[PDB]
Protein: Tyrocidine synthetase III
Organism: Brevibacillus parabrevis
Amino acid sequence: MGVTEAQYVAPTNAVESKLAEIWERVLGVSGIGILDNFFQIGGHSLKAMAVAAQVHREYQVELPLKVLFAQPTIKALAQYVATRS
């Protein structure tokens, strides 16, 4: 689904740039970022990072609404839900 190299890889914070880099280099290998596709939209992949988002939301089961994946602004959730403390 438009997996094609996204011309919107421009990140706002270093945290978003790093996350997008490691994710689109080990899984995506395409060239996406903050333009939605398969990652930040609903797909909970099969990595530990996903399982964490699942438990951090009390078993999302289906859709991870506002937790880490379902949101084109990782830095936003990073200082909200991911802040933990």
Summary: The two ends are 36 Å apart (CA to CA).
